[PDB]
Amino acid sequence: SMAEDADMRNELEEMQRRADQLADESLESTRRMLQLVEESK
Amino acid sequence: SADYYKGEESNSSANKCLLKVAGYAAQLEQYQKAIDIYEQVGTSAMDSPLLKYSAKDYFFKAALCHFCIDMLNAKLAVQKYEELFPAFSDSRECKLMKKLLEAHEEQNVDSYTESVKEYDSISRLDQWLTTMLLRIKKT
């Protein structure tokens, strides 16, 4: 009388890597491009 | 000097002389002269392809000068200015003053301050423009 094994509930897909600061950096460059393009006119 | 230049048939300098005269006059809180000179310069430069685009700045200056008169006609003035120069809508100045008027309609100084701060951050403002903006704020 030993509770038999149980099937692994399932998989809950969840993926997180290095986006935060990589895209914040990406942004800081576009802003400066915009400023320069504005300045030229 | 401008009258002499006109009498000498020497153009392209009377326009700048009148522009500088209007810019100086607006300092002393005299709007009618400034409005007339700015609109004259704008209509003179509208048909010139070289200065046609720059005419938008003159219209914006005139609108700013006309803003202090009263909001009721200022909106109409902006609409009229937009009507004669529909390309004026492309310039960010139209939306800028629209947001400023929206903020002022309910004494919401926070929105106007935010808009002015954003405009300064994106591009530097002139001393005369900053003075006019602060004067409008005092309203």
Swiss-Prot record, chain A:
Where is the stretch described as Disordered?
Answer: 2-24
Top-level taxon in the UniProt lineage: Eukaryota
Mark out the compositionally biased spans (Basic and acidic residues): 2-21
State its location(s): Cytoplasm, Perinuclear region; Cell membrane; Synapse, Synaptosome; Photoreceptor inner segment
PTM characteristics: Palmitoylated. (Microbial infection) Targeted and hydrolyzed by C.botulinum neurotoxin type A (BoNT/A, botA) which hydrolyzes the 197-Gln-|-Arg-198 bond and inhibits neurotransmitter release.
Provide the assembly information: Part of the SNARE core complex containing SNAP25, VAMP2 and STX1A;this complex constitutes the basic catalytic machinery of the complex neurotransmitter release apparatus. Recruited to the SNARE complex following binding of the SNARE complex component STX1A to STXBP1. This complex binds CPLX1. Found in a complex containing SYT1, SV2B and syntaxin-1. Found in a ternary complex with STX1A and VAMP8. Interacts with HSC70 and with SYT9, forming a complex with DNAJC5. The interaction with SYT9 is inhibited in presence of calcium. Isoform 1 and isoform 2 interact with BLOC1S6. Interacts with CENPF.
Q: Which family does the similarity line name?
A: Belongs to the SNAP-25 family.
Q: What does this protein do?
A: t-SNARE involved in the molecular regulation of neurotransmitter release. May play an important role in the synaptic function of specific neuronal systems. Associates with proteins involved in vesicle docking and membrane fusion. Regulates plasma membrane recycling through its interaction with CENPF. Modulates the gating characteristics of the delayed rectifier voltage-dependent potassium channel KCNB1 in pancreatic beta cells.
Q: What is this protein called?
A: Synaptosomal-associated protein 25
In the complete protein, the residues contained here run 1 to 40 of 206
From Swiss-Prot, chain B:
What Gene Ontology terms describe where this protein resides (cellular component)? glutamatergic synapse; neuromuscular junction; postsynapse; presynapse; presynaptic active zone membrane; synaptobrevin 2-SNAP-25-syntaxin-1a complex; terminal bouton
Q: Which domain of life is it from?
A: Eukaryota
Signal peptide: which range, if any?
A: none
Protein's UniProt keywords contain Ion transport: no
Record GO biological process: apical protein localization; brain development; intracellular protein transport; membrane fusion; neuron differentiation; positive regulation of ATP-dependent activity; protein-containing complex disassembly; regulation of synaptic vesicle priming
Q: Which GO terms describe its molecular function?
A: protein-containing complex binding; SNARE binding; soluble NSF attachment protein activity; syntaxin binding
Its subcellular locations are: Cell membrane
Please list the coiled coil stretches. none
Q: Which residues carry this modification: Phosphoserine?
A: 48
UniProt KW keywords: Acetylation, Cell membrane, ER-Golgi transport, Membrane, Phosphoprotein, Protein transport, Transport
Do the record's keywords include Acetylation?
yes
What assembly does the database describe for this protein? Answer: Interacts with PRKCABP, and disrupts the interaction between GRIA2 and PRKCABP, leading to the internalization of GRIA2. Found in a complex with VAMP8. Component of a SNARE-like complex that contains at least ZW10, USE1L, RINT1, STX18 and NAPA/SNAP-alpha. Interacts with VTI1A. Interacts with STX12. Interacts with GNA12 (via N-terminus); the interaction promotes CDH5 localization to plasma membrane.
What the record says about family reads: Belongs to the SNAP family.
| Role, per record | Required for vesicular transport between the endoplasmic reticulum and the Golgi apparatus. Together with GNA12 promotes CDH5 localization to plasma membrane.
UniProt-recorded name of the protein: Alpha-soluble NSF attachment protein
Query: Which organism does this sequence originate in?
Result: Rattus norvegicus (Rat)
